[PDB]
Symmetry: C2
Subunit: 187 residues, 2 copies
């Protein structure tokens, strides 16, 4: 299913974001090792300078991509779980909303926009009212393992790491550089 894929792609993008962070550290630490040293390798430093810059962009891009893939997993679960609920109790629910919804298939586009808006307001109130009970919410059994595993939200670290913006111009430059940085044989 799409949710299994979406999950896999997520934990993957997380792992990727964390790798990039590692690599940035690795570079940063080598830069610092060098400046603390007595030699004066102008060129190694200027290439480490560039590498560090690239890795920061990479940490940024990876973080964003991770957040969205996280959200996706949630988005998909909600969707399917809700559908499985409509499957179960969709008749009971539309019955309760019958004064708004009855003859919906029969409605015009302005009738149908109206009807849904007003039903969705009534549903908003009902949900809030049930919330105020303070009953504790657990994930749907079916997707609990996945949803727990990915976490409730992305650690704010990723939100922070993705905060900065990059033009598609920069993205082009940097993606080229990343690809060059990819092929590099260490020596």
């Amino acid at each position: 299913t799409a949710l299994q894929q979406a999950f896999d792609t997520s934990q993957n993008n997380k792992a990727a974001w964390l790798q990039r962070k590692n690599e940035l550290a690795a570079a940063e630490q080598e830069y610092l090792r060098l400046l603390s040293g007595e030699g004066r390798n102008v060129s190694r430093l200027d290439e480490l300078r560039n590498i560090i810059e690239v890795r920061k962009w990479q940490v940024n891009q990876a973080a964003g991509r991770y957040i969205r893939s996280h959200e996706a997993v949630q988005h998909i679960s909600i969707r399917d779980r809700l559908n499985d609920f409509m499957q179960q109790h969709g008749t009971a629910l539309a019955a309760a909303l019958a004064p708004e919804l009855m003859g919906y298939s029969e409605l015009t586009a302005i009738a149908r926009n109206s009807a849904i808006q007003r039903a969705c307001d009534a549903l908003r109130e009902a949900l809030l009212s049930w919330l105020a009970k303070g009953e504790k919410i657990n994930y749907s059994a079916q997707d609990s393992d996945i949803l727990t595993t990915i976490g409730f939200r992305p650690d704010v670290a990723s939100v922070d790491d993705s905060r900065e913006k990059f033009t598609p111009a920069q993205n082009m430059i940097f993606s080229r550089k990343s690809a060059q940085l990819a092929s590099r044989q260490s020596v």
Copy 2:
């Protein structure tokens, strides 16, 4: 209960709206009887002229008041039916929305506005999806008799009759006149 009262007040306001319409007709028909006649009762005609005017306002005011009382009955049913549904399946429903809702009691006001908006969007989609099945919607068993009885909507006659607007100024004049028209002993 409030719904039983609301219903009673409705069919009442309908009956009232229809009475006023009758009375207007009665007056109108007497006016016409007179103009078709040979005599020339200047004064009866000018008092029938005023009565007709009042009755039109009354038909207008009664119609509006009826519409809103109708809506009210529906509004209340929806509310209670939904609550009875949340009672039943509120746990299943919040579970499905757990990625949005989990830790709602814990949320800030901006967190809580956000969370509900997004849940209510997911619920909008789910409902629409279930609608598209084209399954036929019946009133909740518990309120079926009432809801059927009052009708799905007010006949458009009432919408038409209430169409015109009246300032609170006019309303004062006319309500005075209606009260004078009330005490009149026919002779």
